[PDB]
Structure formats: structure tokens, C-alpha cells
């Protein structure tokens, strides 16, 4: 019955502002306080404040009081959280919350970075790979923004032994990710391995054959 609907994701530049919406349904909007909670990637939960939809009275956490505005549109059962003067520390999943129910959250990513397709580089089985009958090979998907990028191998024909790592934000503000697969070292001469990289946000599609090199 209780539904708390939030937007998917948002990319904002430093110093800019973001106005998150939280649409509620399933109960009496004004009868409940709406909380906003922040969660930085792999971080804990932090309460930002609440607003009483009935009167508009808000109560804040001092850290956000000076930059956050909590408003409500009772006509549309929507609470809004505008956070101003964003910096990278504001990149996080922001949830709206009412007693017992949590929204799915909106991932806000603050970056001065521009859209860019990944450079895909082969992580080749050389000799320093092969763990006996097991070689590791993969693709380094570098310098793309924003996330995400999907990587598959041999057009989905290869699923076993695949590890696509969570992306990391380089100091350049661009992401980088690696996808690796462990395969029988003896299959390197009878089987071709191709990582299929698709960065839909910049529609860059790339097929890189990862070929063994042994000087």
C-alpha cells in the first residue's frame, strides 16, 4: 500500500543544486513526517531532516540546515529536497522516508566531468597470467563517464569465471573498470575471447579481442 517514489539518478556539477522529489501514495500524505536520508556509496545512513507536510515545519540536522530546503507539494503528495552548493561530498543515494517505509532512493552524482566513452584495453594472458591450466584475461575499460558500462564476453557465450569489478572514480573524475575471466590456458589456441563493452550513456560499443601475447 505505502509507496515512496523517487527519481532514478541525477548528474550535477559542483556548486550547482539538485531538487529531489519523493512522491508518496498509499496513506495520508499530511499525516506523516517525511524524512530525507543520505547515504554515500559504501557509507552509512545520515539523517538530513524532516518536514511535516501538514504545516511545512521542517527540522534539520545542523550539517544540512544551511544548504538544504525541504518543501512539499500536498497537491501531488510530493516532498522535495533541494540541496544547494553541491560538492563531490554530496554524491550519494538520497532517500525519502516516512515511519516504516523507505523510498528506493535517488543516486545523485556530482562531477564537473563530461560525457566520455571508454577506451577499452586488453588485459592479456602473457605468462604472468596462466596459473597452470588457468589463464586470466580481461578488458580494462578506462576513462568513461558517467557510469555504468556493461561488459559481456563472447557475446554472452562466456559467463563462467567472469568477474566484472565495480567501477572506481579516478582522480581525473572519470571512471575505470575491469572485467576479467579465468579460462583453461589450453583453450587459448582454440578459443577466441572477446569482451563486449557497451557504454550506453555515450553509445560507444566496443568489441576487443583479448589476444595472448608471449613475445
Amino acid at each position: 500500500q505505502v509507496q515512496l517514489l523517487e527519481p532514478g539518478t541525477e548528474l550535477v556539477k559542483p556548486g550547482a543544486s539538485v531538487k529531489l522529489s519523493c512522491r508518496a501514495s498509499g496513506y495520508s500524505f499530511t499525516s506523516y513526517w517525511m524524512h530525507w536520508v543520505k547515504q554515500r556509496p559504501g557509507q552509512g545512513l545520515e539523517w538530513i531532516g524532516l518536514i511535516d507536510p501538514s504545516n511545512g515545519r521542517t527540522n534539520f540536522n545542523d550539517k544540512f540546515k544551511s544548504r538544504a530546503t525541504l518543501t512539499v507539494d500536498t497537491s501531488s503528495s510530493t516532498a522535495y529536497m533541494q540541496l544547494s552548493s553541491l560538492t563531490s561530498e554530496d554524491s550519494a543515494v538520497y532517500y525519502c522516508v516516512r515511519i516504516a517505509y523507505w523510498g528506493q532512493g535517488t543516486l545523485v552524482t556530482v562531477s564537473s566531468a563530461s560525457t566520455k566513452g571508454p577506451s577499452v584495453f586488453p588485459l592479456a594472458p602473457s605468462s604472468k597470467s596462466t596459473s597452470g591450466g588457468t589463464a586470466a584475461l580481461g578488458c580494462l575499460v578506462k576513462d568513461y563517464f558517467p557510469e555504468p558500462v556493461t561488459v559481456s564476453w563472447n557475446s554472452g557465450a562466456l559467463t563462467s569465471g567472469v568477474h566484472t569489478f565495480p567501477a572506481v572514480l579516478q582522480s581525473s573524475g572519470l571512471y575505470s573498470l575491469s572485467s576479467v575471466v579465468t579460462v583453461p590456458s589450453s583453450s587459448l589456441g582454440t578459443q577466441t575471447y572477446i569482451c563486449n563493452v557497451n557504454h550506453k550513456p555515450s553509445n560507444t560499443k566496443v568489441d576487443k579481442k583479448v589476444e595472448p601475447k608471449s613475445c
Binding site: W47, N59, F60, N61, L123, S126, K128, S176
Partner: protein, 214 residues
């Protein structure tokens, strides 16, 4: 602000195991504490509220209880759906505050990582940068130390690591460490090594490759 000290921050356990998480309050909160579960997929669900009342949507293997300033969440017998993050939340005072959380992971026997190292592709070198990848594969537990040495000189602040979630089938982790250097620096050096320490390794494992070779 009312502090909530949640312990332990991390916990490894097996199916069928009994586990209790606890949150200690700095000041009296009179049972105004809830326990939240955040599934791997990010969704958050309240399990217990008012410290001891089981939320209708929550399984009976969960229960809350309080001893003075200690509030605990106990899972009678852990099931697969219980391996997640847990947070206690207090609503006695403002600002609302949360405990630091408890990440519950699957316990399995130690497994040394398979380590692989990858030289930069000549393809990448054409762009002025060099990434060297050290791959730690299918290991357990999660804790692993990876250090980069370039011509035996410990590298610092120029590498980044990434770890996958615990594997659904074998409960292992895989870790990737990437060392980034300018093409210039990369060419000013010969031996690139990645030294790994992990509980399943009785000794540090080093994988390396020479630039002035294969």
C-alpha cells in the same frame, strides 16, 4: 547529537547460525529504536521498531531486545536472505541518528587468492598513460593487502582497488588493484610487481613482469 554505537561493524556467519547485533545509546532513548535491513540491491526495510516489536513484514527469526542502554537485534537461525547490512535508528531525539551499520557476510573456509598481473597494453601506452593490473581471484576472507612495487620501490597513492561482492556460488571475493603511471614513468622502470598478503597465504605472493622483457 545522540550517538548510536553499533557493533560489530562487520560479521561473518554461516546459515543456521544465531547472531545478535547491538546498538548502544549515549543517552536514554526509552526503547525508541528501530532496526533496518539494507539488502544488497540497496532497498531498505525496517525489521524491528520500538526496540522489540517485530515489523509485520519481517520473519520471526528476527527479534529485538534491550538491556539498559544496549539494544540488540538477534537472528535466531540465519538464512540466505539475511546476509545484508543492518542499521539501528533512534527516534527519541533530534537529529535522528543511525548506528554505523553491520555488514553481514557469508562465512566460508579460507581460500588463498589466485593472483594475476597484467602489463599495460601497448595500445594504452600510445595514449601516454600506463595501467598495471593486479588481479586477486576467488579468495576468502575479503581482507587482502596488495602493494605495488616498481623497481622494488613501494608505490603509494597511485593505485586504486576494486572488490566484487561475495560470490553467489562459492562465497569468495575477487579484487582488482590498478596502478596508474604516466607513459614516461612506466618507461623509466623495469620490474613491476604486485605483492599480496592474505590469510590463506602462509607467505606473501608476488607476481611481476619486466618491461624490458616479456
Amino acid at each position: 547529537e545522540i550517538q548510536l554505537t553499533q557493533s560489530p561493524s562487520s560479521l561473518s556467519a554461516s546459515l543456521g547460525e544465531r547472531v545478535s547485533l547491538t546498538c548502544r545509546t549515549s543517552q536514554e532513548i526509552s526503547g525508541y529504536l528501530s532496526w533496518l535491513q539494507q539488502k544488497p540491491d540497496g532497498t531498505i526495510k525496517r525489521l524491528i521498531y520500538d526496540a522489540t516489536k517485530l515489523d509485520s513484514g519481517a520473519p520471526k527469526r528476527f527479534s529485538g531486545s534491550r538491556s539498559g542502554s544496549d539494544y540488540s537485534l538477534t537472528i535466531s537461525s540465519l538464512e540466505s536472505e539475511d546476509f545484508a547490512d543492518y542499521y539501528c535508528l533512534q527516534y527519541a531525539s533530534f537529529p535522528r541518528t543511525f548506528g554505523g551499520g553491520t555488514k553481514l557476510e557469508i562465512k566460508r573456509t579460507v581460500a588463498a587468492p589466485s593472483v594475476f598481473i597484467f602489463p599495460p597494453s601497448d595500445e594504452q601506452l600510445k595514449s601516454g598513460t600506463a595501467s598495471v593490473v593486479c588481479l586477486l581471484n576467488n579468495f576468502y576472507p575479503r581482507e587482502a593487502k596488495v602493494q605495488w612495487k616498481v623497481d622494488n620501490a613501494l608505490q603509494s597513492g597511485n593505485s586504486q582497488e576494486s572488490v566484487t561482492e561475495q560470490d553467489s556460488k562459492d562465497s569468495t571475493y575477487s579484487l582488482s588493484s590498478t596502478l596508474t603511471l604516466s607513459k614516461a614513468d612506466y618507461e623509466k622502470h623495469k620490474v613491476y610487481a604486485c605483492e599480496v598478503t592474505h590469510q590463506g597465504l602462509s607467505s606473501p605472493v608476488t607476481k611481476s613482469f619486466n618491461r624490458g622483457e616479456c
